[PDB]
Amino acid sequence: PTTTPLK
């Protein structure tokens, strides 16, 4: 799994 640009 991955994650979207955390900002």
Ligand SMILES: *[C@H]1O[C@H](CO)[C@H](O)[C@H](O)[C@H]1NC(C)=O
């Ligand atoms: C996590 O990042 C990867 C990089 O290709 C994919 O874009 C994936 O779809 C992402 N997962 C989510 C939940 O956005």
Ligand SMILES: *[C@H]1O[C@H](CO)[C@H](O)[C@H](O)[C@H]1NC(C)=O
């Ligand atoms: C997505 O979020 C996760 C958890 O915070 C990680 O920081 C990961 O490095 C993030 N992905 C991107 C592409 O920044």
